[PDB]
Amino acid sequence: PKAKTHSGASKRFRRTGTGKIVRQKANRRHLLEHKPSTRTRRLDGRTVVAANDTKRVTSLLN
Amino acid sequence: LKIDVKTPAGKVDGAIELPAELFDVPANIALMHQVVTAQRAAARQGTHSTKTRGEVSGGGRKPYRQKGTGRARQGSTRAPQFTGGGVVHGPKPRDYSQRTPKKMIAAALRGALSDRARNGRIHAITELVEGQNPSTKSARAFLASLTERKQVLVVIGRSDEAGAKSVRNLPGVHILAPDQLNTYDVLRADDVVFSVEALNAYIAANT
Amino acid sequence: LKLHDLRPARGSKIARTRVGRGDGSKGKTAGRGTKGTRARKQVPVTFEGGQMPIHMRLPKLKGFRNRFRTEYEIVNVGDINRLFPQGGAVGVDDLVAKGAVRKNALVKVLGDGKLTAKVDVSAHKFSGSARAKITAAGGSATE
Amino acid sequence: ARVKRAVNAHKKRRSILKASRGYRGQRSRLYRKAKEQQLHSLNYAYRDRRARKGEFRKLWIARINAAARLNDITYNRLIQGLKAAGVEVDRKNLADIAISDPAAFTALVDVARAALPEDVNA
RNA sequence: CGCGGCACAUCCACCUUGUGGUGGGUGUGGGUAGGGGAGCGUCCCUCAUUCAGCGAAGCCACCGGGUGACCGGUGGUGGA
RNA sequence: AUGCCGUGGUGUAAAGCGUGGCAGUGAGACGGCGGGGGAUAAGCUCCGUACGUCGAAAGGGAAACAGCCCAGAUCGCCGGC
RNA sequence: UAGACGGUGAGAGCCCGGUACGCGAAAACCCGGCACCUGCCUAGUAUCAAUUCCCGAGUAGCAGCGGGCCCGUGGAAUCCGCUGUGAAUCCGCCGGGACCACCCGGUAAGCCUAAAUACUCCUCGAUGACCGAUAGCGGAUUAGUACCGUGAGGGAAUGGUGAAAAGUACCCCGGGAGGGGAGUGAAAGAGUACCUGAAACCGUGUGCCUACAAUCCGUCAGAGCCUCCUUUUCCUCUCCGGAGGAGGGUGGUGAUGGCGUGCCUUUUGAAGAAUGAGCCUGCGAGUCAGGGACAUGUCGCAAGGUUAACCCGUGUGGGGUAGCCGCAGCGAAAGCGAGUCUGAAUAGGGCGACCCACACGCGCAUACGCGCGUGUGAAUAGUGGCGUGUUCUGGACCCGAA
Numbered sequence A: 001p002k003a004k005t006h007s008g009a010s011k012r013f014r015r016t017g018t019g020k021i022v023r024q025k026a027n028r029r030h031l032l033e034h035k036p037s038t039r040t041r042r043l044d045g046r047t048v049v050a051a052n053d054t055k056r057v058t059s060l061l062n
Numbered sequence B: 001l002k003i004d005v006k007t008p009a010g011k012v013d014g015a016i017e018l019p020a021e022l023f024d025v026p027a028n029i030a031l032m033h034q035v036v037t038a039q040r041a042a043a044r045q046g047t048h049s050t051k052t053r054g055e056v057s058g059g060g061r062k063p064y065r066q067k068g069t070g071r072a073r074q075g076s077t078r079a080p081q082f083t084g085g086g087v088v089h090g091p092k093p094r095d096y097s098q099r100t101p102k103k104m105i106a107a108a109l110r111g112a113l114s115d116r117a118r119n120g121r122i123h124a125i126t127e128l129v130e131g132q133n134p135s136t137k138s139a140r141a142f143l144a145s146l147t148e149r150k151q152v153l154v155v156i157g158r159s160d161e162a163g164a165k166s167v168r169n170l171p172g173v174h175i176l177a178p179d180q181l182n183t184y185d186v187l188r189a190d191d192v193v194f195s196v197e198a199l200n201a202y203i204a205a206n207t
Numbered sequence C: 001l002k003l004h005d006l007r008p009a010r011g012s013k014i015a016r017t018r019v020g021r022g023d024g025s026k027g028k029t030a031g032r033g034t035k036g037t038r039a040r041k042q043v044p045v046t047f048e049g050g051q052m053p054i055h056m057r058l059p060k061l062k063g064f065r066n067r068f069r070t071e072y073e074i075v076n077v078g079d080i081n082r083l084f085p086q087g088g089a090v091g092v093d094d095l096v097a098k099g100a101v102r103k104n105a106l107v108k109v110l111g112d113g114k115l116t117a118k119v120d121v122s123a124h125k126f127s128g129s130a131r132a133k134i135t136a137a138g139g140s141a142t143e
Numbered sequence D: 001a002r003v004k005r006a007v008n009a010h011k012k013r014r015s016i017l018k019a020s021r022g023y024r025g026q027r028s029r030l031y032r033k034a035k036e037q038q039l040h041s042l043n044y045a046y047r048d049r050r051a052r053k054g055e056f057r058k059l060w061i062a063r064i065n066a067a068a069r070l071n072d073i074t075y076n077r078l079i080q081g082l083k084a085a086g087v088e089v090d091r092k093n094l095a096d097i098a099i100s101d102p103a104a105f106t107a108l109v110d111v112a113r114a115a116l117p118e119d120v121n122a
Numbered sequence E: 001c002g003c004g005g006c007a008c009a010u011c012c013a014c015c016u017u018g019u020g021g022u023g024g025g026u027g028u029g030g031g032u033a034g035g036g037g038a039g040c041g042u043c044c045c046u047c048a049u050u051c052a053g054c055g056a057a058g059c060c061a062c063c064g065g066g067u068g069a070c071c072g073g074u075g076g077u078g079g080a
Numbered sequence F: 001a002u003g004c005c006g007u008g009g010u011g012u013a014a015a016g017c018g019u020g021g022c023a024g025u026g027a028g029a030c031g032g033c034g035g036g037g038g039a040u041a042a043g044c045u046c047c048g049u050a051c052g053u054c055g056a057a058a059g060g061g062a063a064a065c066a067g068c069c070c071a072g073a074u075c076g077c078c079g080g081c
Numbered sequence G: 001u002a003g004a005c006g007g008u009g010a011g012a013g014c015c016c017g018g019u020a021c022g023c024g025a026a027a028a029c030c031c032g033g034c035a036c037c038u039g040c041c042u043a044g045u046a047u048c049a050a051u052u053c054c055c056g057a058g059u060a061g062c063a064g065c066g067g068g069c070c071c072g073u074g075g076a077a078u079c080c081g082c083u084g085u086g087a088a089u090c091c092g093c094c095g096g097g098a099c100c101a102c103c104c105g106g107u108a109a110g111c112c113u114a115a116a117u118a119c120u121c122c123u124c125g126a127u128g129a130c131c132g133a134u135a136g137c138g139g140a141u142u143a144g145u146a147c148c149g150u151g152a153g154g155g156a157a158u159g160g161u162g163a164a165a166a167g168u169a170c171c172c173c174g175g176g177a178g179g180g181g182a183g184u185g186a187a188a189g190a191g192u193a194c195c196u197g198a199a200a201c202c203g204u205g206u207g208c209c210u211a212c213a214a215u216c217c218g219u220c221a222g223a224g225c226c227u228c229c230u231u232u233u234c235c236u237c238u239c240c241g242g243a244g245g246a247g248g249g250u251g252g253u254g255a256u257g258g259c260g261u262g263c264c265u266u267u268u269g270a271a272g273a274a275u276g277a278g279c280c281u282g283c284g285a286g287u288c289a290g291g292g293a294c295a296u297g298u299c300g301c302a303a304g305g306u307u308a309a310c311c312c313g314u315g316u317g318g319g320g321u322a323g324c325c326g327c328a329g330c331g332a333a334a335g336c337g338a339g340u341c342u343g344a345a346u347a348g349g350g351c352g353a354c355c356c357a358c359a360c361g362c363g364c365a366u367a368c369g370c371g372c373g374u375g376u377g378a379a380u381a382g383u384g385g386c387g388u389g390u391u392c393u394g395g396a397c398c399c400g401a402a
């Protein structure tokens, strides 16, 4: 039986050209009036997955 | 590199050149071992079977009450710890055969035949029996003249029925077609005996 | 020769671990030890003890996927130069035969590496740098 | 293939039962009880092989003390005097001498007494 | 600490001077959960070889052996 | 006073750091010192302590006596300190 | 052309049934062929005309409520059901994922249709790195039997003398049962309680110890007895053999001295007065599947590696390029590409490519390199198979509820 991948994990993670796994950052969907532009700029963009969670994230993605 | 072609109840009548790329390949023991193992694995039937606790006859109801008895609770009478109960992790029908790549298979066969040729255990003959009537006596005499060892492999064309039947029932003689050569049979054989047409067909097939 | 002479390469075959067979090996708990969930079952990978998991507390990657995207099989002028030091007309089937590109696919030429041979290559959708390098070397880049 | 356990399984049973001969009760008859007694027996033997060195030294010291006090000196001062005289005769051989050659033991006592200092309390 | 046997690691020189062996120093060798390494014994198949109604297997006794799981020899019973 | 951060020397094989495979553990106990709760009682309860032992540590001492004192068992010896 | 298998007083190609190979069917049935027989064909072909008719109805469409499609009602197309309303016949109608226009495709609401696919109560012929009497079917034995239940149902246990009954004539003790002597048999150390014949368990004989002692039953120290062998001096009968004397060593026993809180599980901690175990023999728990996922060892080929289905072969062999992975990345995407995205930015950032232990010419600095042309040759790389560890979906290490 073919292995199945996790749907939410595939929707929330992706790999780069050399094999790193990147993600987007939370706290940036609503309630933006009180957040300074410095905070929102920090939350903007993509970032790599922590070395503590990389094993579980890899297992989810595979 | 050059073997002599012999005739039954006769003498030499030709010579056949063995190309180096087919009969001079170095012997790779590990590769030959892997290919031979895969062959013997594919040769298995794998028709063993047992019954699990779900497949043993009966055993549906809970035999008695859990509490107030003074005995172990049992759940079913076909639990594996019971006599006559099911088998745990027992044999089931299996398919033993591996996916050995063609390059490895061919390399192992070529190495086996190279070993045979290098040691000088390859013989070529025109035919096994003069006429169209098989004769095990004359065939056995011819092979005894050619060689004296217990195991012999005979490679003859699929259309040479008289030669096939003449050596069919000789002990220690194995027969196969040119396109069915393989490492296990070649390595089991002490000597390899080729018909001229079979040798040419094999060489032409392998270019 | 002689099937009783074949042996496997060293280190290719190791004995399996049989895990419930006494005290001199993985003893009785068979490497589990515990008394909890892991003593009898597996814990699902998605489970994090009850707090919102990593794959649920993080946002979905933004965007969409193009249903009609066209993909090209690319090759660099450096590769072309290495494969065809003699120059001459070069086509998609020649690229496939030389094995620098997949078959039954659109071919796009990119401009990485250096090119000295004069080649009149034909493909789809050249790059600007590749076109410049082709015309500088003296060949032609046609779709 | 199905393998019957009996041929392999009886070897350790035979060895344990042969080793447990001479025990009384279940301990020489049943394999399960002979196994526990074998565990205890071998632990006891290991412990006692180390302890018997101390026990034999104790016996030698007692016999040497008896001989010394027979020759009117304490074990204390006899050992101290032999060390002073530089005699490195063993305690085992000292006890053997005490039992076998009393004249030799007496000579050793005089040697140790001479080697002792003039006042042992200074 | 003394004398003798074993093992692991490291260092020093030889042998194919790391696949590993030869000799010599130095350190180390309690151990549950657990991790790594290497082995004993039972059965079946294949290849080679060898024993067997002048007695196989199995069982029983005795005498020995190995660092362990365990092994060998001799006799008795037995009958493939 | 200690403890903590950095730095220059000296010493020390089985320290440390990175990245992978495979874990177990996440009920601790008593003792010393510093505290809270309690009545400054508890073989009470909760914290700290490059503090110890037990857990997972046999041997000698404390009459007996997981947790106290000494001391960490490769094997043999009818040797010594 | 026969060395398959089995039997026969122990391993048989030449002893037997057989095997290779070759012959064989009254009749019946199946299949095929030929006739009889049956039925169809008995002028319409093309051209033109574009005026008319027909082209499957309570159907399609539409609305409501549902079902099902990757699609959980959603912007929801296509398909199916009930309710209501309800068309047109080619200038018709339906489809191409709401819908509209254009274009493309097709011709619903009638019916039939081989082969490639699925299965084995059953009948022949084979096979097994399957079981071998607690196994394998519940069932080698009277087996769905005995037995249990009102019933639906549940559901066992029990194989082996010997080559051949040659199955012990006869005599004796005995009511018999049973035994002894004879006898058969290679063997009764095969006697219808029968091949081999283990352990628990129960006797009989015998060596040692034990009735003033407080014992996890052992261990270390240790006298004394008993037994069997050897070195001495003695019976020198001595070819003896050894009584006997001493010594030494085997083996059995163990007066007496010290030390010593059973095993497992679970626990901070149990000899524990916490759990479990009367005893022996047999059985009883990390397995298998998948071109699954991750990591490793090893092997083949290598910028390539590899086939799936399937085809052909007595096989494990030969074909088979569809596909998969590698071969360039960045971006939500259009797209661009060794760069790309954000951005006004040729700013900075993120991700991705890019080598130097070096030389030579170029500008370079005292040197060190900074990009280029080559070597002083600066080293990459994947992929397929097979082992091992872990993991996924499966009953998934085994056992256990209400």
Ligand SMILES: [Mg+2]
Binding pocket: A029
């Ligand atoms: Mg938003």
Ligand SMILES: [Mg+2]
Binding pocket: A032, A035, A036, A037, A040
């Ligand atoms: Mg803002």
Ligand SMILES: [Mg+2]
Binding pocket: B053, B054, B055, B058, B059, B060
């Ligand atoms: Mg059932």
Ligand SMILES: [Mg+2]
Binding pocket: B062, B075
């Ligand atoms: Mg149930």
Ligand SMILES: [Mg+2]
Binding pocket: B084, G138
């Ligand atoms: Mg049954």
Ligand SMILES: [Mg+2]
Binding pocket: B084, B085
């Ligand atoms: Mg069964």
Ligand SMILES: [Mg+2]
Binding pocket: none
């Ligand atoms: Mg193939």
Ligand SMILES: [Mg+2]
Binding pocket: C028
């Ligand atoms: Mg246990």
Ligand SMILES: [Mg+2]
Binding pocket: C030, C031, C032, F023
């Ligand atoms: Mg583990």
Ligand SMILES: [Mg+2]
Binding pocket: C033, C034, C035, C036, C038, C039
């Ligand atoms: Mg746990």
Ligand SMILES: [Mg+2]
Binding pocket: C035
């Ligand atoms: Mg716990």
Ligand SMILES: [Mg+2]
Binding pocket: none
């Ligand atoms: Mg447990």
Ligand SMILES: [Mg+2]
Binding pocket: C044
């Ligand atoms: Mg799941």
Ligand SMILES: [Mg+2]
Binding pocket: C050
């Ligand atoms: Mg919550």
Ligand SMILES: [Mg+2]
Binding pocket: D022, D023
């Ligand atoms: Mg005794």
Ligand SMILES: [Mg+2]
Binding pocket: D053, D054
């Ligand atoms: Mg000591």
